[PDB]
DNA sequence: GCGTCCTTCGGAAGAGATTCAGA
DNA sequence: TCTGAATCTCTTCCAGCACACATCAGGACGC
RNA sequence: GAUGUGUGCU
């Protein structure tokens, strides 16, 4: 479902900011997950350009740079 | 006839059916409940007398001493209402209650006392209520809203459906006390009875059964009936009750007295039962295997050895019956556990019950209530006795006991406030019966199960808490007392009572800040029934049936007046005729109907007495005698209406207005509006701000006068007489000799309340509506309050509207307003607002208010005086200095930006200890002069009146008028008269004159002391200067205007006069609305109001034309009589032949602006009468006239609707909503811009607005939205420098709120970090 | 934060930290004095409870409260929930260079323009005014320019006009449901305090003018300005992102103007005349020699791009009206004449804009939308399309349909009480019969409304579609439908409770006659259902879109 | 006046703990 | 009498923006 | 800064 498919993503930041912050952060801390800042909510929270529109070219340049 | 407040402009009424009961006092709930709370009750039923007796007498821990109550007295308030509002202290009266401390003699529990001493100890201070139902708590006026909560008692709810996910409907019974703990019983999906105290956890109800000291045999005796098995020669026959064979299957061949009645496997119908009854038999044969499915009630012990064979509540079998046969117990008793009717719920509860006796049940109850502690016997017994069997920890009120004893169908309604064993037993029995099928649940939304807790009861409850805390302190202290030295004041602490009462009246969910921006707002705030608050339901845990309008709301709660938004249906409004029962329930008047006659005796029927009779409806025709003109009249019998005969009815509604509230009954043609539009119209009519000149509604309802008079804003005369002297600030009434008392007669002065600030920064200002030397009766208005016109609620202006599209300037909902409307200042409003400049003695030295301001020129200091404050009358604008305050190193009080004004008042409060400033001294001197002058002036006025009365008594019994004038007025009381009782009257009047002189002197001294007082303030403030501005907000494009039918609108253009459409007479149209707003939202009442206002203004135009050229009184009288005779069959019936040919000239002058029309709520005018009234003038009957274009000069090619609609001005002013913010002030924890308009704050670009920028793909815009003008700090200033550098480029960093998030995660045991 | 006086603010984290430190210090002291075992174990338990209350308060048995029985927020209550550092300060923030005011129409505008109040744009574009004041040399520092802007001198307004020229601002309404709730307009400075909003984008914003406010946001950087001009511009937002239908559709007044214009009645000031073009039709209408609803023959040159982008003219002589010929003067070249030669409603001109965009492009579509709005407002003003009380014509056979249905319901009651149907089927059959009766009454009143225009053909009587105002604004799709118009002159019908159940009894009166003291009470059930449904069940539809956005 | 201090009550859904039953 | 199915119990969620007002912030007891 | 109440548009 749209709740489980959003709470079970690979980025713990999106899941924590969506719902069940305590339960998401507990699992992330136990499992030692490492977020890659791949979505749009993650870059909004961090404070970067979203990899969606005019920032998509910049994010492609940054990804292929390294 | 008509009084002089009615024979000055008499409103034409279209009401067809007469009214047999006038509208009662509107704010009569607050005034009655607080009167019950505040007055002396010798019996002690309700009020403070019932709160002291509920606690006092208070004794020690059997320490041979007692403290007991005697009487209480309320002293005069320290300041009156006006002075309390000026200063800012609670309008309260000290509570002086006479206590009496008695300690007995030693070795004498009932003997004499060592001493008896008594004094009145000051404990607490209860705020008094004004004459309008408003409380002055901290200078601001508060209104304590009534509360609609569940009545105490027993309610059998359902919990139907969604539980257990199998469809099985459970059953629960809740015993709600007024004070105490709940006693929830409920059923199990396996049909068990679980009690639940305070909703903690389930355990079997048989635990409470044994806790009530009941044995299992007694329990089975209570909840079951016995069936007897007897030991005989053989076959072990059973006693038979033929009714027990109703609806089951015969397990074998039923026979009695030999012959077989019912064969094996047959059904036992009613015929078989009746035939067995006619057989008159009692005994039948029964196989031994049939008793295998039975349960023994009473335990059986051996007759030989005494050992128990079978205990109580256990199944039987063949071996058990064999062991019983050899014992010798000739009688066997079992339980009649029917499968459908007499379910064995108690037996299953006992089987699942783990406890065995009273002690173990008490232990289990104690473990449930207080876990984590080893239970002992005495503590558990004390707890269970304190739960529902003590008057101190549990109390069903009188209404609670009434509901409890009426729900269980008992006879007597009085009883003990505590629960008893019988009450619990009957509650469980009724729950079991409801489970069986006999009886039914009751709905919570029924108005017969919901009370009203008004101001008095709620205030009394908190006083009880304060007294409980005080008596707990006394209990702690009374055993440690040093006797013979304890006055009845050393143990009474006034802090708990005062703290509790202040906590209730100041900071509560029902001590609401009064919504006061017209009389309607306050009269509907006082008459508000809020389901929220303490003891009520929260907004989140509110179902969709509580919000809904119940059928029992008819006549008790308005259906159409409830606020939109989060709480709709929880804030119900009281009806016009609704009252409060002696217990608290709502009731409505009804005309009692005999066999065929509708009498005039009104009975107030509650919400539970209404469902028994069949009640007719208000719009049922009668013919001069109380007989229904038709055979079948539409009536509502039991929550469901249908046609009933004229003989079955026994009640009838008083009027069509009794279902709607006082706010929804001011909407003309309410029966034509959609009820959503009715709700919006009621709310907007509550929101209207009073304009500059009040203007009556041409189309009204007849309840405008009732709201105007009963709100309290109008100075209504107390005793009738002749206006002796009318000034712009006072009215003096020469009382008639008929109503003048023999002693202390004098006259009465009405001091009007001039321009002053209300709660919503509006201007409430009374002005006289009477003339000099004009006769006034009792209870007629003298001064029109805010938005009042000759004692008639006038919240707006009669606007000449046209419904037509005009070049898109009324596109969606906008209004196009002519320039003449703003030229005439029709919608111009006064907005008096105050500004405070507190001077707090901070560190580095205190502050000052000196007139020299550093780094500021003399341009801003020109308006300031030498003392630093601004002159009264200065036309200050935004940004000017009002009070020049300097902190120890400039923080002077400035006018907020964007508002002009005019300083009309300056008040300086100085802490006692700061000497003074010369402006404070000037204000004090002027106030002293005014306070002496007013007292001297009132003494002179009612002393000239007293001397006039002395002369009027002197004329009887030998008067000499020639010597009276030349004699000085000092010696006028002992002049020529005999020694009869008239001389006694003269002596009494002389003594009254001397007493008035002395009272004036002493009150002058008191006023001098009060003005020269200290007026202590908050800790750490030196002096406060409150400057009152007075803005005149003219109308402008942007501010909301609305009608009375929920047709809102924001003005889009102030069009010139020559551009507005005009008719063939050249008259411009003031307002052009949009036609398409009418069909979509079915507010057709605005079109009918437009047509009726057109007719009213046509009548007014005809009167004005007949009056402009001076015609004889005959023609005016003829035409006005024609206008007042129009109608089918009206109740008005006004004859102008009784007018004195000059009272009709005043009427004609008042009608030249347009004849006011009364159009009752559901008994209004019809279209035939509207068309006939249009015919009475010269206007077309269709309501539509020909309008030509204002600018192009060519006609609109269709007739358009033109008429006078009563437009309001809602106080959603555009200049109070416009806001802008560049780089300004930021928050503290997260470096974000602040939020709000009072604070300089930026609009929130919320979560839903970020998805809108993500959808476009705007990534740079979003990035600058959340970093550069947001949480980020260094980039925020770099961007500002770039913007003022000619370069629009950003260098964003990281938002500060993300670092806050990282630190807050790290503050837990979680380690979050950014990798490289 | 120090308040007024010597007191301090009531912080929750500080209170929790003080409790934890008190318990920890007490345990540390008891661990050195060798306290009895029960006391030290109880103190350790209290320390555990204090730490649990500090980390996540309320997850244990009872949440500790600070004052007057309210649970103080722990280190988790300020990171989770709707009021935490995730949904309140990171996914959406407060912004500088922002404003807020009510909105008015101002229909003189264009699709790329809005009206900023003159005193609001001065406070929004304040650093931009500072920059140009320092550039032009009227000020030497930032404080001199700040004081000059504060004083609002005569030169500041010219600087504001220069800096506001091509700097688009973002107008956002409070519920930003879809992406068309944020759009960029080129400001047009106005005197006032209300933000004039173009009437075409009101459908996209879902913004009427009855007291609602919109927020202004100023794009700062060059990239932000170009994103507002190329992506968020209201000119580039003429199609809904959900479906390809146009979203800047004329609504409720322009459609009424275009429906009164493009219409015909069988008579005129001049009907048999034949014209030489649309200019002749406009000249005849303005001079008053021909009604707007004539049936004349105009000679019209329509273009067509059936070739590879070449507009080939084809002049003919078509049977049109004067109003349609006048409207043809604004239709851009390339569109067939068989789109205005009919009675234009709302769907018709929505289709006209859609085909204009699909054939011609974006710029002709925007210019066409502006011209359509102008000529709809003008010819709706020039008609006086009012609404009276005689326009809601009651049918003369409604009570016969009422009597038939009440007889049917009486027969249903007699069948139910006998035992033919249960109490769950009587409900359904009575709802069905009353809904059929309501539809029959609606059909009767609609037939009595739509065609009730008996007018001579200059000879004998003839029938035509009615010019009744209620029917005009119902058929044109301006504002209304069969339901709302039916409730005015037909019968209101039967209501629905908040739970969803339909009322057993129907209302047999309309909003032109009165309503009973009881029929209004019955209607209040549905009226309160309608108002409770929004405020209490749009939460579980905003939740749906929130957890749809957060999953995709 | 300063000043140190130690109630209960919605409601649908989902997950994870018991607990049943049934072969 | 072991293991899926059912039931019980605990948990988390319940739209957006904005405006106005008041009240709190330790209050008890020692000094 | 948080609560409590009222309110505006959806
Ligand atoms: C005797 C009088 C009616 C006269 C017959 C009875 C009937 C209902 C009783 C009040 C209600 O219970 C509510 C409230 C409960 C509080 O606990 C104590 C005060 C209140 C006001 C009660 C006082 C009094 O007892 C009342 C008025
Ligand atoms: Mg709106």
UniProtKB/Swiss-Prot annotation, chain B:
Keywords: Acetylation, DNA-directed RNA polymerase, Nucleotidyltransferase, Transcription, Transferase. GO terms for molecular function: DNA binding; DNA-directed RNA polymerase activity; ribonucleoside binding. Coiled coil: none annotated. PROSITE patterns: RNA_POL_BETA (PS01166). GO terms for biological process: DNA-templated transcription. Belongs to the RNA polymerase beta chain family. DNA-dependent RNA polymerase catalyzes the transcription of DNA into RNA using the four ribonucleoside triphosphates as substrates. NCBIfam families: PRK00405.1, rpoB. This is DNA-directed RNA polymerase subunit beta. It comes from Escherichia coli O157:H7. The gene is rpoB.
């Amino acid at each position: 479902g749209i709740t489980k498919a959003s709470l079970a993503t690979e980025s713990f930041i999106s899941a924590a900011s969506f719902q069940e912050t305590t339960r998401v952060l507990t699992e992330a801390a136990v499992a030692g997950k490492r977020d890659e800042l791949r979505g749009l909510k993650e870059n909004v929270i961090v404070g970067r350009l979203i990899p969606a529109g005019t920032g998509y070219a910049y994010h492609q340049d940054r990804m292929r740079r390294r | 006839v008509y009084s002089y407040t009615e024979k000055k402009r008499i409103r034409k009424d279209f009401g067809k059916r007469p009214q047999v009961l006038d509208v009662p006092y509107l704010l009569s709930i607050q005034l009655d409940s607080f009167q019950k709370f505040i007055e002396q009750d010798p019996e002690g039923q309700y009020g403070l007398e019932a709160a002291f007796r509920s606690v006092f007498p208070i004794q020690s821990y059997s320490g041979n001493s007692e403290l007991q109550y005697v009487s209480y007295r309320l002293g005069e308030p320290v300041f009156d209402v006006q002075e309390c509002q000026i200063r800012g202290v609670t309008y309260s009266a000290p509570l002086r209650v006479k206590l009496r401390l008695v300690i007995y003699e030693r070795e004498a529990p009932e003997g004499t006392v060592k001493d008896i001493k008594e004094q009145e100890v000051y404990m607490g201070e209860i705020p008094l209520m004004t004459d309008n139902g408003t409380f002055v708590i901290n200078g601001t006026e508060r209104v304590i809203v009534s509360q609609l909560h569940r009545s105490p008692g027993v309610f059998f709810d359902s919990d139907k459906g969604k539980t257990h996910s199998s469809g099985k409907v459970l059953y629960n019974a809740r015993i709600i006390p007024y004070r105490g703990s709940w006693l929830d019983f409920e059923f199990d999906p396996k049909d068990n009875l679980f009690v639940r105290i305070d909703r903690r956890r389930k355990l079997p109800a048989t635990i409470i059964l044994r806790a009530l000291n009941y044995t299992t045999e007694q329990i089975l005796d209570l909840f079951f009936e016995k069936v007897i098995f007897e030991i005989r020669d053989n076959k072990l026959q059973m006693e038979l009750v033929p009714e027990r064979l109703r609806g089951e299957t015969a397990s074998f061949d039923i026979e009695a007295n030999g012959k077989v009645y019912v064969e094996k496997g047959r059904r036992i119908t009613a015929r078989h039962i009746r035939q067995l009854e006619k057989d008159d038999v009692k005994l039948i044969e029964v196989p031994v295997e049939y008793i295998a499915g039975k349960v023994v009630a009473k335990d059986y012990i051996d007759e030989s050895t005494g050992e128990l064979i079978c205990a109580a509540n256990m199944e039987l079998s063949l071996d058990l019956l064999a062991k019983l046969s050899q014992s010798g117990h000739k009688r066997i008793e079992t339980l009649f556990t029917n499968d459908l009717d007499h379910g064995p719920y108690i037996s299953e509860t006992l089987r699942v019950d783990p406890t065995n006796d009273r002690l173990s049940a008490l232990v289990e109850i104690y473990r449930m209530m207080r876990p984590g502690e080893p239970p002992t016997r005495e503590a558990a017994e004390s707890l269970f006795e304190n739960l529902f069997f003590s008057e101190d920890r549990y109390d069903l009120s009188a209404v609670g006991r009434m509901k409890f004893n009426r729900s269980l169908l008992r006879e007597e309604i009085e009883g003990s406030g505590i629960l008893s064993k019988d009450d619990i037993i009957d509650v469980m029995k009724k729950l079991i019966d409801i489970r069986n099928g006999k009886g039914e649940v009751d709905d919570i939304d029924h108005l017969g199960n919901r009370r009203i807790r008004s101001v008095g009861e709620m205030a009394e409850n908190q006083f009880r808490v304060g007294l409980v805390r005080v008596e707990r302190a006394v209990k702690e202290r009374l055993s440690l007392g040093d006797l013979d030295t304890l006055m009845p004041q050393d143990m009474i602490n006034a802090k708990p009572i005062s703290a509790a009462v202040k906590e209730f009246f100041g900071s509560s969910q029902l001590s609401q800040f009064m919504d006061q921006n017209n009389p309607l707002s306050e009269i509907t705030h006082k008459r508000r029934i809020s389901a929220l608050g303490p003891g009520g339901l929260t907004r989140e845990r509110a179902g969709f049936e509580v919000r809904d309008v119940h059928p029992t709301h008819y006549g008790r709660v308005c259906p159409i007046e409830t606020p939109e938004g989060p709480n709709i249906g929880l804030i119900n409004s009281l009806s016009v005729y609704a009252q409060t029962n002696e217990y608290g329930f709502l009731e409505t008047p009804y005309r009692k109907v005999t066999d065929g006659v509708v009498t005039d005796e009104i009975h107030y029927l509650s919400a539970i007495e209404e469902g028994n009779y069949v009640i007719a409806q208000a719009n049922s025709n009668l013919d001069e005698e109380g007989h229904f003109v038709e055979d079948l009249v539409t009536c509502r019998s039991k929550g469901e209406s249908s046609l009933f005969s004229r003989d079955q009815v026994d009640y009838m509604d008083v009027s069509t207005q009794q279902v709607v509230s006082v706010g929804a009954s001011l909407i003309p043609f309410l029966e034509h509006d959609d009820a959503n539009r009715a709700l919006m119209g009621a709310n907007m009519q509550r929101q209207a701000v009073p304009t500059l000149r009040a203007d009556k509604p041409l189309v009204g309802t007849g309840m405008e006068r009732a709201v105007a008079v009963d709100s309290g804003v109008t100075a209504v005369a107390k005793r009738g007489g002749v206006v002796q002297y009318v000034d712009a600030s006072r009215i003096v009434i020469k009382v008639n000799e008929d109503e003048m008392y023999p002693g202390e007669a004098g006259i009465d002065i009405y001091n009007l309340t001039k321009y002053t600030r209300s709660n919503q920064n509006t201007c409430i200002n009374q002005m006289p509506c009477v003339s000099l030397g004009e006769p006034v009766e009792r209870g007629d208005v003298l001064a029109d309050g805010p938005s009042t016109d000759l004692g008639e609620l006038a919240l707006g202006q009669n606007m000449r509207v046209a419904f037509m599209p005009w070049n898109g300037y009324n596109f969606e909902d906008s209004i196009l307003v002519s320039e003449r409307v703003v030229q005439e200042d029709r919608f111009t409003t006064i907005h008096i607002q105050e500004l405070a400049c507190v001077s707090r003695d901070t560190k580095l030295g205190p502050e000052e208010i000196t007139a020299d301001i550093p780094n500021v020129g003399e341009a801003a200091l020109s308006k300031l005086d030498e003392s630093g404050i601004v002159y009264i009358g200065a036309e200050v604008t935004g940004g000017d200095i009002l009070v020049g305050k300097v902190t120890p190193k400039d923080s002077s009080l400035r006018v907020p930006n964007g508002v002009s004004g005019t300083v009309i008042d300056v008040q300086v409060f100085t802490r006692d200890g700061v000497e003074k400033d010369k402006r404070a001294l000037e204000i004090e001197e002027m106030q002293l002069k005014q306070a002496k002058k007013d007292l001297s002036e009132e003494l002179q006025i009612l002393e000239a009146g007293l001397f006039s009365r002395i002369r009027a008594v002197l004329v009887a019994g030998g008067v000499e008028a020639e010597k009276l004038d030349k004699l000085p007025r000092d010696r006028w009381l002992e002049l020529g008269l005999t020694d009869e009782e008239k001389q006694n009257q003269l002596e009494q009047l002389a003594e009254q004159y001397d007493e008035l002189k002395h009272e004036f002197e002493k009150k002058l001294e008191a006023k001098r002391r009060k003005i020269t007082q200290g007026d202590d303030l908050a800790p750490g403030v030196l002096k406060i200067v409150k400057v009152y501005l007075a803005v005149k907000r003219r109308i402008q494009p942007g501010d909301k205007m609305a009608g009375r039918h929920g047709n809102k609108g924001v003005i889009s253009k102030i069009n010139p006069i020559e551009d507005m459409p005009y008719d063939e007479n050249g008259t411009p149209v003031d307002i052009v609305l949009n036609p398409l707003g009418v069909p979509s939202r079915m507010n057709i009442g605005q079109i009918l109001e437009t047509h009726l206002g057109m007719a009213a203004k046509g009548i007014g135009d005809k009167i004005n034309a007949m009056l402009k050229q001076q015609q004889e009184v005959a023609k005016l009288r003829e035409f006005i009589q024609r206008a007042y005779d129009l109608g089918a069959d009206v109740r008005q019936k006004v004859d102008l032949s009784t007018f004195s040919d000059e009272e009709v000239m005043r009427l004609a002058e008042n009608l030249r602006k347009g004849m006011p029309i009364a159009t009752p709520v559901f008994d209004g005018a019809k279209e035939a009468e509207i068309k006939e009234l249009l015919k009475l003038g010269d206007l077309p009957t269709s309501g539509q006239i020909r309008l030509y274009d204002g600018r192009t000069g060519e006609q609109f090619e269709r007739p358009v609707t033109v008429g006078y609609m009563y437009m309001l001005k809602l106080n959603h002013l555009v200049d109070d909503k416009m806001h802008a913010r560049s780089t300004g002030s930021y928050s503290l924890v997260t470096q974000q811009p602040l939020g709000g308009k009072a604070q300089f704050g930026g609009q929130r670009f919320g979560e839903m607005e970020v998805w809108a920028l993500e959808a476009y793909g705007a990534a740079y815009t979003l990035q600058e939205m959340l970093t550069v003008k947001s949480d980020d700090v260094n980039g925020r200033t770099k961007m500002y420098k770039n913007i003022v550098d000619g370069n629009h480029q950003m260098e964003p960093g990281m938002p500060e709120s993300f670092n806050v998030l990282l630190k807050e995660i790290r503050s837990l045991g979680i380690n979050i970090e950014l990798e490289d | 934060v120090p308040l007024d006086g010597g007191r301090f603010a009531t912080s929750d984290l500080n209170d929790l930290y003080r409790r934890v430190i008190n318990r920890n210090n007490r345990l540390k002291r008891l661990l050195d004095l060798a306290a009895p075992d029960i006391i030290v174990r109880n103190e350790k338990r209290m320390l555990q409870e204090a730490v649990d209350a500090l980390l996540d308060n309320g997850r244990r048995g009872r949440a500790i409260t600070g004052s007057n029985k309210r649970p103080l927020k722990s280190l988790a209550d300020m990171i989770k929930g709707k009021q935490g550092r995730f949904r309140q300060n990171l996914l959406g923030k407060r912004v500088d260079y922002s404003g807020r005011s009510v909105i008015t129409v101002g229909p003189y505008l264009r699709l790329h323009q809005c009206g900023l109040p003159k005193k609001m744009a001065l406070e929004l574009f304040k650093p931009f005014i500072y920059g140009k004041l320092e550039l032009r040399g009227l000020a030497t520092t930032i404080k001199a320019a700040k004081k000059m802007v504060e004083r609002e001198e005569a030169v500041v307004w010219d600087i504001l006009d220069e800096v506001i020229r091509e700097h688009p601002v973002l107008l956002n309404r409070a519920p930003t449901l879809h992406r068309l709730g944020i759009q960029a307009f080129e400001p047009v400075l106005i005197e006032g305090k209300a933000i004039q909003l173009h009437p075409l984008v009101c459908a996209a914003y879902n913004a009427d003018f009855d007291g609602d406010q919109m927020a202004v946001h100023v794009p700062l950087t060059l990239e932000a300005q170009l994103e507002a001009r190329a992506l968020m511009m209201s000119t580039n937002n003429i199609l809904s992102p959900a479906n390809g239908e146009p979203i800047i559709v004329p609504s409720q007044d322009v459609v009424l103007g275009l429906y009164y214009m493009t219409r015909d009645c069988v008579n005129a000031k001049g009907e048999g005349m034949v014209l030489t073009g649309p200019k002749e039709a406009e000249r005849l209408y303005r001079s008053g020699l021909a009604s707007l609803h004539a049936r004349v023959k105009v000679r019209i040159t329509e273009y067509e791009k059936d070739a590879n982008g070449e507009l080939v003219a084809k002049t003919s002589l078509k049977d049109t009206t004067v109003g349609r010929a006048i409207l043809w003067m604004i239709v851009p070249k390339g569109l067939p004449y068989s789109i205005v030669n009919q009675a234009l409603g709302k769907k018709a001109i929505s289709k006209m804009l859609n085909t204009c965009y699909r054939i011609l492009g974006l710029k002709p579509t925007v210019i066409f939308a502006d011209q359509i709005m102008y000529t709809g407002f003008a010819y709706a003003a020039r008609s006086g399309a009012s609404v009276g009380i005689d326009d809601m014509v009651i049918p003369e056979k409604k009570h016969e349909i009422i009597s038939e249905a009440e007889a049917e319901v009486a027969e249903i009651q007699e069948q139910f009480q006998s035992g033919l149907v249960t109490a769950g089927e009587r409900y359904n059959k009575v709802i069905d019969i009353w809904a059929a009766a309501n539809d029959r009454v609606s059909k009767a009143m609609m037939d009595n409304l739509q065609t009730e225009t008996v007018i001579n053909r200059d000879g004998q009587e003839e029938k035509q579609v009615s010019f009744n105002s209620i029917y005009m604004m119902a058929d044109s799709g301006a504002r209304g439908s069969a339901a709302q118009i039916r409730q005015l002159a037909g019968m209101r019908g039967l209501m629905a409770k908040p739970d969803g159940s339909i009322i057993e009894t129907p209302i047999t009166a309309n909003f032109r006659e009165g309503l009973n003291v009881l029929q209004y009470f019955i209607s209040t059930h549905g009226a309160r259902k309608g108002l409770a449904d929004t405020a209490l069940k749009t939460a579980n539809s905003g939740y749906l879109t929130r957890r749809l956005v957060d999953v995709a």
